[PDB]
Amino acid sequence: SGNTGSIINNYYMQQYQNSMDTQLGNDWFSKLASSAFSGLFGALLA
Amino acid sequence: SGNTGSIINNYYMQQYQNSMDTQLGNDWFSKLASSAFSGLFGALLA
Amino acid sequence: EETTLLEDRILTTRNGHTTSTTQSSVGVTYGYATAEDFVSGPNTSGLETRVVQAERFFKTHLFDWVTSDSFGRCHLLELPTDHKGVYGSLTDSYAYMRNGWDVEVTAVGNQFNGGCLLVAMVPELCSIQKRELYQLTLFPHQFINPRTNMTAHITVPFVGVNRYDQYKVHKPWTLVVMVVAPLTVNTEGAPQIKVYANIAPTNVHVAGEFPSKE
Amino acid sequence: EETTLLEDRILTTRNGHTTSTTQSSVGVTYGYATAEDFVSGPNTSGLETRVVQAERFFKTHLFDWVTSDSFGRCHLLELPTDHKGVYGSLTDSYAYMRNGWDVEVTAVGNQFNGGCLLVAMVPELCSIQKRELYQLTLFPHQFINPRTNMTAHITVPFVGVNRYDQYKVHKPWTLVVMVVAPLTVNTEGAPQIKVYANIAPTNVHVAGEFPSKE
Amino acid sequence: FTGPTDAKARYMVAYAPPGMEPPKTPEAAAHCIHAEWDTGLNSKFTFSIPYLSAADYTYTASDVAETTNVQGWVCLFQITHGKADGDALVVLASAGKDFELRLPVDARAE
Amino acid sequence: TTSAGESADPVTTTVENYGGETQIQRRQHTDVSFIMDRFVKVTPQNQINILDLMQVPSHTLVGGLLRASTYYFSDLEIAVKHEGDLTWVPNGAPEKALDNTTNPTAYHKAPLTRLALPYTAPHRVLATVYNGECRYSRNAVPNLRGDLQVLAQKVARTLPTSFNYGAIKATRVTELLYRMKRAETYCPRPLLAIHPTEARHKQKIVAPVK
Amino acid sequence: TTSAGESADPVTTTVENYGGETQIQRRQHTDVSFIMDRFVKVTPQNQINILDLMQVPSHTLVGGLLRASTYYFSDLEIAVKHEGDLTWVPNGAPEKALDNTTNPTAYHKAPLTRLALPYTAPHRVLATVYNGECRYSRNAVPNLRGDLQVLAQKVARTLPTSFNYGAIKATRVTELLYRMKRAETYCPRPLLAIHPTEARHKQKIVAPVK
């Protein structure tokens, strides 16, 4: 997903090539840049 | 099943890569650790 | 009761992250009630809060029961007493408080001792004449008698003319341990029995937050 | 915004039994998140508790903004700082803690002053070179500019390589107030502006109760 | 407990977490996560020491007292006894239900 | 557009405000996973090298951009030029473990060894900067207040001992490169260009031939 | 909880007894097959080496953990650095067979030879420890009674001759590593940490840079 560009699957298992992530129970700055006011606050003449 | 992590099958037959096991006719310590009393032997107040 | 030379009258009390277990139980005595009355009255105007972190056992030594103590020898402990933990810090951070008490008193010698202790929780104990000690069983109590048990457990609610107290000027409860029959040690008993209390405040509510000294 | 010589951008923040009201609001800045992440993880083994009595405003003076302070004059306050109240007592009763911060910074002069203050909440602030001050807006912030407002409000969560902190050895957040344009007083402004913080810890959780000194 | 039948005792185990000095008295120790029990029919009491740390894992090896390698103290006190003078309490340790070891290392040693 | 400048709410105008037209943008190159995922050379120690991403010089692309985050996560690749065999040991290992071959040891094969390594720290995330101590047996850290001067107490601090991806050891290690895999970055921090003496920073840029 | 200590029935309490919560555990690393399945170096003999797992030093991870079982099974991998060609011969072979190339012989290819070998012993399982003799022509083994002293008679015993995975021979073997494949372990036996002089065994653990 970074800079990798092989079209065939890894010979090794994912359990081996990378650490495995666990859960309990872009993101912020994407939401922040999308929320930006892009308008005009006056009244527009012409 | 130990420390092996290849996703494709072995080029050699299993008869060659490993000794073959025979039958006649975890296990104990798993059963032993599962059987452990985890409770309380009193009566619980509050 | 239950079995050969030792026993299975076995109780574990939990108060917070602290537990206490006895194998010579005899049960617990509930004094005056089974529940507290209302914790949220007019006098706190909805401003009171429970502080669950103070509901746990703290410990103090009471006295050493020896063969020369006679019927009517007492040891009083007024409640609340000095607490150098989170209950103790509440009394300096809030003007008004209320809590009941879960009380556990120990007198371990062995089963070859004799004699008997009455442990009791008395409200508003200002004075007790000698003759009144014959009626101390009027109060929430339990005995410690070596041949049967080593632990007494009494659970008592908040009581008072007022729904929240100011503990820096009033002590609603006094733990009293009284010798009813003198300790006998014979050839095999413990030479003396040290008496210890393990006490937990229950249902502690505070209101009226003080300034700091800053 | 709203009306003649003074204003109705009017906000009341409540934290516990303490409130704060401004009539020159500008809104609040939420830093990095809108909610805290999970408060109950593996590292506390279910033993953690919330202590709602510490979630309330305490106050400290920060500095006096005067006409000789130049762009880049800063005042840092590392958080947590000395608290002589119930939050402060938690840090001596529990080994591990976590809380976010609801921060309110005031700079009252009047609307005839000029100049501008950036207030910001920076994590792990160990050092800041002069040139980096041009990028302090990377952090959760808000300005105080006399012609518009006298209050900045930033609300920030707990952050850290670890889910619970030990505050006696690590300070996750630093409040920084920076002068971006020097104070002007002209004939009618306030001769100087004292800057004060009103801070509330939010969501305080503690785990791992310490002995006493008894 | 390994004493005779006429030997009685009451004990306390407390977990003292890091960041201040471990308690020297049952009374100071009362404010820790603790358990107290006495002798009777049943000779054994078992207690779980909790994993409480800032990080999610801690080290098995130790270096010099730090965050990642010391996790505080365990404190065993005697409240009182009745004629148990000289009697032995023997103690054992086993892994709890969620005890976990990770990251194999060979470091000379046994 | 006019707005309330004190707010901090992002305001992004477009050329449409005066009759232009916003174009499409393809931002694949400023994606954190992609840009962090290239090797960067570090100056190695003769023999023991502890794998610590804060070793990559702050001016490099990966050092520049790694320091622009407060907390980060990644797996790691290293490529190492070394004499003898290369042993790696996880985060938390005794340093004497570096001499035992059951720990991941790679036998010399010219010209270099490239290895995929897991994140092994005991923390959910690591930090480029940390305002505190990991040694216990000390006296408590102060709650500093004051201006920038106050921050000079902290300069003798080393990042916690747990902040590493283990360590490697060989008879001589000659070259070491790190490459962050699957990188995540949280809480941006300052990124500084070169400060020019002149109005514009000028450099010889690569141009045709004659 | 209280229990009858004399019983030997395992008693596992949890932090729930005082209001905590038991977490999930991932125990993939203390699985016998996985942990036994890594190479470990042995000090080789100049030429003939009989393949005997009890040759791996008792302090190593694989030696430590192999001796914590009484009976075991596995297949084997070896990697060998050698001059000439390497011949291996199964369990039960005459030692002069080591010189005949129809027996599995690997021709030298730099830097080393790694081979998958089967379990060849005549026993359903092998043992790390064996209280007896395999030579017949003797007098019967005593039925010892007494304290620990009585066990000193047994020190001159070598494990039965059938307890091996064959033997290998080359002109010079310089390095030999074993790796247990598909390992099974039965009947745990003691596993000893280092005994400290001090209250805590302290070691330099791998920490950042400066």
Cα(C44)–Cα(C42) distance, integer angstroms: 6
Q: Give the Cα-Cα-Cα angle A12, A18, A19 (nearest 5 degrees).
A: 135
Alpha carbon distance G47, G171 (integer Å): 6
Which residues of E fall within a CB distance of 8 Å from F102?
A: 106
Task: Find the CB nearest E98 among G6, G22, G201.
Answer: G22
Q: Are strands G126-127 and G69-83 parallel, antiparallel or unpaired?
A: antiparallel
Residue E106 CA to residue G62 CA, distance in Å, equals 9
Q: Which two tokens stand for residue F151?
A: 């921050």
Q: Is B28 helix (H, G, I), strand (E, B) or coil?
A: helix
**How long is chain G?**
210
- Closest chain F residue to D147, measured at CA: F6
Rounded to an integer, what distance in angstroms lies between the CA atom of residue F42 and that of residue F53? 9
Report the half-sphere exposure of G52 (CA within 13 A, side-chain side): 18
Torsion angles phi and psi, residue F105, rounded to 5: -115, 130
Interface of D with G (CB under 8 A): 42, 45-47
Type of residue at A22: T
Q: How far is A34 from chain B (nearest CA, A)?
A: 41
Give how many domains chain A has, as a whole number: 1
Give the whole-angstrom CA distance, residue C198 versus residue C134.
26
Helix ranges (DSSP H) in chain A: 14-17, 27-34
- Cα separations in angstroms, C185 against C112, C116, G63: 7, 12, 59
Chains F and B touch (3+ CB pairs under 8 A): no
Contact C31, C173 (CB under 8 A): no
- Report CA F33 to chain centroid distance, whole Å: 13
Tokens matching residue F61: 């692309």
In Å, how far is B34's CA from the nearest CA of chain G?
Answer: 9
Give the 3-state secondary structure of residue D18.
strand
Instruction: Provide the residue range defining the domain that includes B34.
Output: 1-46
In contact, C206 and C51? CB cutoff 8 Å: yes
Q: Contact at 8 Å (CB) between F100 and E106?
A: yes
CA distance C24 to chain E (A): 7
Q: Which two tokens stand for residue A30?
A: 């994407």
In whole angstroms, what is the distance from residue G132 CA to residue G144 CA? 12
Residues 6+ apart with CB under 8 A from G42: G55, G56, G57, G176, G177, G178
Chain-centre distance for alpha carbon E68: 19
Resolution (angstroms) stands at: 2.6
**Two tokens at D149?**
């407002």
Q: How many whole angstroms separate alpha carbon F163 and alpha carbon F150?
A: 25
Q: Is omega for the bond preceding D191 within 30 degrees of 0, making it cis?
A: no
Q: Do residues C96 and C207 touch, judged by C-beta distance below 8 A? A: yes
Q: Measure the CA–CA gap between C163 and F14, rounded to whole angstroms.
A: 66
Q: How far is D39 from chain E (nearest CA, A)?
A: 12
Distance from C-alpha of D128 to C-alpha of D25, rounded to nearest angstrom: 29
Residue E75: helix, strand or coil by DSSP? strand
Instruction: Give residue for tokens 């003769």.
Output: F46
Q: How far apart are the C-alpha atoms of F199 and C124, rounded to whole Å? A: 86
Residues listed for chain C: 214
Cis peptide leading into D157, omega within 30 of 0? Answer: no
Torsion, Cα of G152, G158, G160, G161 (10° steps) = -170
In 3D space, the residue among D199, D157, D124 whose CA is nearest the CA of residue D39 turns out to be D157
Q: If phi over 0 gives left and psi between -120 and 50 gives alpha, with beta otherwise, what is residue A38?
A: alpha
Which residues contact residue C72 at a Cβ distance below 8 angstroms, ignoring those fewer than 6 apart? C130, C133, C178, C179
Determine the residue type at D24. Answer: S
Cα–Cα dist D103/G40, whole Å = 58
H/E stretch holding F117: strand F113-117
In order of C135, D48, E13, E94, G8, the CA distances from E97 in angstroms are 52, 20, 20, 10, 18
**Angle at the Cα of F47 from the Cα atoms of F45 and F48, rounded to 5 degrees:** 80
Q: How far apart are CA D154 and CA D119, in angstroms?
A: 9
Cβ distance A15 to B5 less than 8 Å, yes or no, reads yes
| Residues facing residue D102 across a β-bridge | D155, D200
- By the 10 Å C-beta count (0-12 exposed, 13-18 middle, 19+ buried), G158 is classed as exposed
| F76 phi and psi angles, rounded to 5 deg | -140, 145
Q: Does E101 touch chain F (CB under 8 A)?
A: no
User: CA–CA separation, G163 vs G125, rounded Å?
Assistant: 9
Coil vs helix vs strand at E3: coil
List, as ranges, residues 70-99 from F with C-beta within 8 Å of A: 75
Chain D segment 3-42 residues within 8 A of A by beta carbon are 32-33, 38, 41-42
Contacting residues for B3 by C-beta, under 8 A, at least 6 apart: G33, G34, G37, G38
Measured between alpha carbons, how far is D84 from D95 in angstroms, rounded to an integer?
Answer: 18
Sort out which chain B residues have CB atoms less than 8 A from A16's CB and list them: 5
Instruction: Decide if B37 and G75 are in contact by the 8 Å CB cutoff.
Output: no
The amino acid occupying position D69 is: D
Among G18, G22, G194, the residue with its CB nearest the CB of E33 is G18
> Of the candidates C180, C150, C148, C177, which has an alpha carbon nearest to the alpha carbon of residue C61?
C177
Q: Please list the residues that pair with C155 across neighbouring strands.
A: C30, C102
> Residues E47, G20: contact at Cβ < 8 Å?
no
The DSSP code for F57 is -
Residues in CB range of C201: below 8 A, 6 or more apart: C54, C55, C80, C87, C99, C100, C101
What is the C-alpha separation between E45 and E42, in angstroms, rounded?
8
Would the CB atoms of E10 and C194 count as touching at under 8 Å? no
Phi and psi at residue B30, in whole multiples of 5°? -65, -50
Helix (H, G, I), strand (E, B) or coil at C42: helix
Q: For an interface test with G, which of C9, C15, C17 has the most G Cβ atoms less than 10 Å from its Cβ?
A: C17
SS (H, E, C) chain G: CEECCCCCCCECCCHHHHCCCCCCCCCHHHCHHHHHCCCEEECCCCCEEECCHHHCCCCCHHHHHHCCEEEEEEEEEEEEEEECCEEEECCCCCHHHHHCCCCCEECCCCCCEEEEECCCCCCCCEECCCCCCCCCCCCCCCCCCCCHHHHHHHHHCCCCCCCCCCEEECCEEEEEEEEEEEEEEEEECCCCCCCCCCCCCECCECCCCC
What gap in Å lies between CA F86 and CA F83, rounded to an integer? 8
C-alpha to C-alpha distance for B8 and F5, rounded to whole angstroms: 60
What per-residue string of b and e applies to C24-57 under the rule 16 or more CB within 10 Å gives b?
Answer: bbbebbebeeeeeeebeeeebeeebbebebbbbb
Burial D10-48 (b: 16+ CB within 10 A, else e): ebebebbeeebebebbbebbbbbbeeeeebbbbbbbbbb
CATH of domain C1-214: 2.60.120.20
Nearest CA to E8 among C23, F7, D90? C23
C-beta separation of F165 from F60 below 8 A = no
User: What backbone torsions phi and psi does residue E59 show, to the nearest 5 degrees?
Assistant: -70, 145
Cβ atoms within 10 Å, residue E7:
18
* Cis amide prior to C42 (ω within 30 degrees): no
**Which residues in A lie closer than 8 A to residue D42 (C-beta atoms)?**
24
Task: Tell me the sheet residues that pair with G116.
Answer: G77
DSSP lists the bridge partners of residue C60 as C197
- Distance separating alpha carbons of residues G55 and G48, to the nearest angstrom: 14
Give the type of residue at F57: P
The two three-digit tokens of residue E20, written as one number: 């201040």
User: Residue B3 sits in a domain of what CATH number?
Assistant: 4.10.90.10
Contact C214, C32 (CB under 8 A): no
Of E21, E33, E53, the CB nearest to D209: E33
Reduce the DSSP state of residue D168 to 3 states and report it: coil
Experimental technique: X-ray
Please say whether the beta carbons of E108 and G33 come within 8 A: no
Instruction: List the one residue out of G148, C6, G104 whose CA is nearest residue E3.
Output: C6
Are the beta carbons of C146 and C189 closer than 8 angstroms? yes
Report how far residue D35's alpha carbon sits from residue A31's, in angstroms, rounded to the nearest whole number. 14
* Domains in chain F: ranges and CATH: 1-210 (2.60.120.20)
Query: Running DSSP on this structure, what letter comes out for residue F48?
Result: E
